[PDB]
Amino acid sequence: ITITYQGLFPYQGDHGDMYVYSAGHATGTTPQKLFVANYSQDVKQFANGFVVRIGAAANSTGTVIISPSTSATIRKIYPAFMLGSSVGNFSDGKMGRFFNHTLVLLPDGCGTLLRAFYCILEPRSGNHCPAGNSYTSFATYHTPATDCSDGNYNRNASLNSFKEYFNLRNCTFMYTYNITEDEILEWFGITQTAQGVHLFSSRYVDLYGGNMFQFATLPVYDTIKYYSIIPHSIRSIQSDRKAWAAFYVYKLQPLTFLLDFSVDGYIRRAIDCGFNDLSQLHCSYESFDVESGVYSVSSFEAKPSGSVVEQVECDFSPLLSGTPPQVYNFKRLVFTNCNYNLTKLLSLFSVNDFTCSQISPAAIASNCYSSLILDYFSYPLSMKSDLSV
Amino acid sequence: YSLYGVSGRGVFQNCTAVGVRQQRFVYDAYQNLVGYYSDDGNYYCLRACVSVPVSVIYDKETKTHATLFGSVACEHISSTMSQYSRSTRSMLKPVGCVLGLVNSSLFVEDCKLPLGQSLCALPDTPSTMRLASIAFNHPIQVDQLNSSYFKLSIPTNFSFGVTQEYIQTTIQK
Amino acid sequence: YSLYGVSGRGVFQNCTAVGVRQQRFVYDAYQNLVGYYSDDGNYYCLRAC
Amino acid sequence: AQLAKDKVNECVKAQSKRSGFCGQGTHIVSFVVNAPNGLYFMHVGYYPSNHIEVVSAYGLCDAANPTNCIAPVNGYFIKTNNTRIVDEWSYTGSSFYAPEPITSLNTKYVA
Amino acid sequence: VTVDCKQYVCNGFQKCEQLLREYGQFCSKINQALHGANLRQDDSVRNLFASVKSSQSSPIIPGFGGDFNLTLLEPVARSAIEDLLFDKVTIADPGYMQGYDDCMQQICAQYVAGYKVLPPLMDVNMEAAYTSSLLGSIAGVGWTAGLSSFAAIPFAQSIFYRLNGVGITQQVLSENQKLIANKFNQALGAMQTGFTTTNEAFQKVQDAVNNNAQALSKLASELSNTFGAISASIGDIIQRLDVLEQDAQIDRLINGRLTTLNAFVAQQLVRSESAALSAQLAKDKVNECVKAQSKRSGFCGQGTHIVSFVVNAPNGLYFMHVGYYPS
């Protein structure tokens, strides 16, 4: 069956966000500094979640990234994500710190499992660690010479690297999902409902076609508002450097698609109905094919600009005319139902001090009120310490 | 705009001169306000929102869409117009001006054939895109003579036969 | 029949072979289910009354 | 359906000397077959398609003035005065192609 | 007229657009239904004029019949009587790259959007071309002797044979005398002066333009502003409460406003089908009363019919049947 269906989809032509992981620095014999992008400080809004194109360039020839003049066969690599409800800065001021319980999705074992865990992430204090000196970014890594030897993949390699930057505390779960090793393109997705966080993959149900199906619901009931991509760097030596397939993240939103279901049930075509009038027409008819003619698609309404508000002008008059009385005979101006230019009034005088209580001078110019009272009097600057709330 | 207790979206113009002028709106027989007041003190008569009444000229045989605007404008639009809300909706994708503005080349290009898919006033728009043919009519006009003789257009070939129309007679019961 | 969260009245037959096969119904463009799954593991496609 | 009965009694039995309804051309035969829910017609019409502009009158006269023109189609061409009209052309001397009405203006041939 | 639903309902507000999503089947059936209605109507226009012209004009020369003063000449393109029944009919429409901007300088088929009027498949010069070649074929085709494989005969002799036919006065009366010509021209002269107001057909014409203009603009003015329970064009727009109950009042306004839009679509199917019945009647009036004579009573109104002329009226044809009246 074909149909029009309303659900979470990426939009037609969306380039998404591209991420790439790189081999680290190395001599001929020794891995050195990790080599990463600035992804940890780039915290994104989760909104409705996202889908991920994984491994698309696998097989093709590409650069090694850290050594652009060096090309290599591209291998699939899996993405890692940090998701949570509250973010901020690390002690040295850098962005990318997730507070309270944080969901971490971290592949491991040279791409043969996914770990999903929900813990408080306590930043560690050693050199280059997030609560230590010389911190730049956290990251994960593995060391292929020792972690990816035939028949003895190190399941925990990435997890162990993560544990160097953070202590995991009060974990409510840690699940693992096995992955068969191959270089096949795949799709991953993540959403959330009141039932928890839902993980999707093409791997188990449509490995060769890409349709995503649910493989887990994680008991995460605090709403995810933020995510970041955890940079991974591969601690290879120079002669072992590979190129790792970029992956692409596309945000989801509620859209109505034409979905074309094959006999075997899979979706091999779709139309993003809102993409343009032609696609719109194409969707009407509840079919992929729409007969040749003129089809009316809706407007195109203009954008609001110059939002006129009408209500006028507050009367500061009797202040300027005469002798300001003494503080104990202060005169009171009351203001109901009018517009005020106060920065006007304060441009006449030379202003020496401006302090407010339960408000700011910035704020008190901007806001609207139901009542404004202005009290004025003669008063010497010498006695500023006595005119205080 | 956003006036006193009333919301709305309008294009104010300094118009003349119809109203009450002491209380400060003017309606036209409905809920709407057409529309001056409030400014101090003039006549800023309002209007309804601007909408571009767009369409689509598919052509599924060659799979070539061609977005036509309704009746405006060759001059006022911009390509992938950024002043307007809904393509519809997420993404979009200029020659007129006989009907309206079209995002499809080209100018007439006369005259063929005529047939579908047969757009509006008279762009007959074949494909392949390549709009605006005006293919009419044209009868084989015998000319009228002046004197006692008068010309006449008799033919030479029979060429019979057509299938013709269904006449429906019933329902399914 | 009376399946998991779904009621209904149908005539199951061992039919072939259209579905998803991992979650366990199949609809046809409406609320109805036409109709196999659930049996273990075959294709008992259902019909209306 | 009352229209179909009007199309069977006119276009199917008789000819019917009327335009579309009996679609597009001087109608000749029409056939009826039962379609789904309705009838269906296979109206066999004429379609001229090779038009040759020739010249009238309008008739003839002589020293004495009885006329000709027309039984039923026009003219009376020239070369010399020949009469296969609608549709093809052109006949012999008339002899049964001629009622004999009153004379008209543009005298002697006979417009 | 086609409504552009999913932006008629609603005015273009995203929550209301999502509540339309929920009803994404109904809107598709609306615009699907109107596009079908316009293809049926457009095939009535196309099939009508393809059963109008076919063959063969005189062509249009300033002297048709000597001396029958015919107003139906094109002066040059929309002849003079056609100019009278387009000037005297009150249309506030249309806009084709001058009327949109011309209304922007200030009916609202191009401002609510909302509803939207499509152009009528044929430019006015070309409908004028059909009926002008039809006026060319009045004389020769009105002869007959077969429809249509003929002719070029002057219009005067066409009305002496059309007049010889059913007003069966033979040749001695039309010879002695004519003028008839001044009585024919006198008849067409009172046919020039009299349109308003007591001369329906013409009130039928403005019953048609006021019919579809009334249905379109006035029914669309009833559809919007106002219908619903709280209906300030968005139920609780931004300015009033709630946010939770906003979907409730808005869903009242969408169920109601779209339901009444669906009543408009049923109405367009009704007047479209009756318009196709009457258009097939017009094709039956052109092939009988306009080409041939037609030896039949009203239809060819009131008297032994002689000539009949066709001019394009608003939305329809228009006939100037020239009948006999004994007295």
Numbering used by the authors:
A (entry chain B): 67 to 377, 381 to 458
B (entry chain B): 606 to 698, 710 to 744, 757 to 801
C (entry chain A): 606 to 654
D (entry chain B): 1096 to 1206
E (entry chain C): 802 to 877, 886 to 915, 924 to 1144
Q: What does the report in the manuscript say about this coordinate set?
A:
The key determinant of host specificity is the envelope-located trimeric spike (S) glycoprotein, which can be further cleaved by host proteases into an N-terminal S1 subunit and a membrane-bound C-terminal S2 region.
The cleaved form of the MERS-CoV S ectodomain was confirmed by SDS–polyacrylamide gel electrophoresis (SDS–PAGE), and further N-terminal sequencing revealed that the S ectodomain protein was cleaved after residue R748, three residues ahead of the S2 cleavage site. The final model includes residues 18–1,206, with several small breaks due to the poor densities.
